[PDB]
Design a protein around this ligand. Structure first.
Ligand SMILES: [Mg+2]
Lengths: 142, 445
């Protein structure tokens, strides 16, 4: 019941323009209004999950207006095992024909007023927080 | 940079030696052709008239629009000393070199030529069957040796010595092998005309004590000769050079008469496609080429997988790119080869992509990229991976008694451009090994 209300609000209520899906919404949920797509975490090397997640924005409402181009961002940590999983879980889309654009720098990111964990104090606090994660009558008696 | 490279060499020649180079009309006819069109116009005017013309008269000929060209033409003409500036009676008179003037007049007027163009025996031979195959194979044999692909016959020591002594095809005895360098890949990229000049230009510099003038009288005279014709026998130094030129696939000898080759005439002036290939997002290569040259060059930075009679198919891999990069090939050169050797189908779709990009938003003119942008980025990214670790050699300076001394020595290194790192808080800095001696000497003084 709660998720249906959330989905309807996001679909028809302009206030909720962004949501945070999970593995449950990885496939078979139709969002005709979705145009942009982002992914933070991943289920290791599965190339199928990559295609299913992309499908949420492939059925956007305005898929015929001039110059329409949906966006799919894949944030991945450099020098980690994520590159092994990223290049391994995106080998199917390349076969289809999709081409990923490498974004080494995002223009205008520094001029945003406030950014989370901008100071070392917050980074240290977060580091410790995440690190610490790991006789039927007798019945009356009783 | 064809004429520029040849012209640059001619400038370093002393004026006393340049005068001797103008004695033979054969060389003059070629040196006349290399100048800019405007320069050639003025030279032809002064050659036949025995008078002195002020430079102001020359300026009158050129329109205001072509004033800039008149500066390059006069500068280039004066650099070669072909135009002699004489100042007298308050006017900067202009005259041509008498030897160059006389040499040009003799050739154009059909006068005595001192056999600068050679002689004819009338013993023509078949060129396509033998000359084309011989020189193409001989020029291909050196390329296969350059590319590193196996081939039974190896080039003679004369050219091999030149290659090692030249920056081209760096070699090491300890390694026991020959590999191409950054300029070597550029050499392979240059057209046949420039591809021949580079080896010849290196040959000009290699030769020492064979006179410098004699070598030029022969090379320039070679272009004058016409393929498929006989020429009797020439200078003594030219005889060994003629045999030397036979090793470069320039002149063919039956064993009294020498026959120039197609490459000889190609040296003077210039003159689906073979070598065209398609690049997919899967890093696959499909070359519509049937020729060892295209196949051999592609294998430098491509992991070939299979081939057909009409086309060759392969796949780009990190290992193949890493092997190419280890040889000194820059990613910019690789993309240039792909862009300049793109299939027409890629160009047409790429043109459509530009048209579509401009059709949607004609305000901006995005660059015409034939191949998908991802390939360029990934290739550049692979280059960044090799440049990840950066290491220098030198000495670290520390334990400074006073900050002033630390700043003085560190500032001195920065001035001479040998400082690599410094830290005011720790009073330490690092300098390159090259500047170590200079810094130490300054420290003592
Ligand atoms: Mg379904």
């Amino acid at each position: 019941q709660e998720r249906m209300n959330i989905l309807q609000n996001f679909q028809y209520n302009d206030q909720i323009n962004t949501i945070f899906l999970s593995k449950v919404g990885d496939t078979s949920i139709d969002l005709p209004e979705a145009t942009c797509l982002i992914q933070i975490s991943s289920h290791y090397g599965s190339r199928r999950q990559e295609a299913q997640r992309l499908g949420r924005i492939l059925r956007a409402k305005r898929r015929n207006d001039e110059g329409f181009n949906a966006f799919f961002y894949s944030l991945v940590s450099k020098d980690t095992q994520e590159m092994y999983y990223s290049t391994k879980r995106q080998a199917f889309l390349v076969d289809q024909g999709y081409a990923f654009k490498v974004i080494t720098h995002l223009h205008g990111m520094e001029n945003i007023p406030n950014l989370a964990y901008a100071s070392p104090r917050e980074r240290r606090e977060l580091l410790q927080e995440v690190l610490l994660k790991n006789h039927p009558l007798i019945r009356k008696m009783y | 940079s064809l004429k520029h490279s040849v012209t640059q060499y001619l400038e370093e020649i002393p004026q006393q030696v340049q005068n001797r180079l103008y004695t033979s009309p054969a060389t003059c006819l070629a040196i006349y052709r290399i100048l800019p069109p405007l320069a050639k116009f003025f030279i032809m005017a002064m050659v036949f008239n025995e008078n002195e013309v002020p430079l102001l008269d020359l300026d009158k000929w050129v329109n205001s629009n072509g004033k800039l060209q008149f500066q390059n033409a006069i500068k280039s003409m004066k650099s070669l000393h072909l135009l002699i500036p004489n100042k007298s009676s308050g006017t900067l008179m202009i005259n041509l070199n008498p030897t160059f003037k006389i040499s040009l007049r003799n050739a154009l007027t059909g006068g005595e030529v001192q056999n600068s163009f050679g002689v004819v025996v009338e013993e023509n031979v078949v060129s396509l069957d033998l000359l084309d195959e011989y020189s193409a194979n001989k020029w291909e044999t050196i390329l296969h040796f350059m590319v590193g692909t196996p081939l039974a016959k190896i080039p003679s020591e004369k050219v091999l010595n030149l290659l090692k002594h030249s920056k081209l095809m760096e070699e090491v005895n300890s390694t026991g092998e020959f590999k191409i360098t950054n300029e070597g890949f550029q050499f392979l990229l240059q057209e046949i005309n420039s591809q021949l000049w580079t080896l010849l230009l290196q040959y000009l510099k290699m030769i020492e004590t064979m006179d410098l003038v004699d070598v030029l009288h022969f090379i320039f005279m070679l272009g004058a000769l016409e393929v498929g014709k006989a020429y009797k026998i020439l200078s003594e130094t030219q005889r060994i050079m003629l045999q030397d030129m036979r090793d470069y696939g320039l002149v063919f000898q039956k064993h009294s008469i020498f026959y120039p080759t197609k490459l000889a005439l190609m040296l003077t002036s210039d003159t689906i496609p073979d070598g065209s290939l398609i690049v997919e997002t899967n890093f696959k290569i499909y070359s519509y080429s049937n020729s060892p040259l295209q196949i051999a060059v592609l294998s430098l930075f491509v992991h070939l997988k299979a081939r057909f009679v009409n086309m060759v198919l392969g796949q780009i891999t990190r290992e193949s790119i890493r092997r190419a990069l280890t040889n000194g090939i820059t990613a910019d050169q690789i993309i240039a080869y792909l862009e300049t050797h793109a299939h027409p189908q890629m160009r047409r779709l790429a043109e459509e992509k530009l048209e579509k990009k401009l059709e949607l938003d004609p305000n901006c003119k995005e660059p015409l990229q034939v191949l998908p942008p991802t390939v360029v980025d990934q290739i550049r990214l692979w280059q960044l991976e090799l440049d990840r670790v950066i290491t220098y050699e030198g000495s670290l300076y520390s334990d400074f008694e006073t900050s002033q001394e630390y700043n003085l020595l560190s500032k001195y290194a920065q001035d001479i451009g040998v400082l690599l790192w410094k830290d005011d808080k720790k009073k330490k800095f690092f300098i390159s090994k090259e500047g170590n001696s200079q810094v130490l000497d300054f420290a003592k003084r």
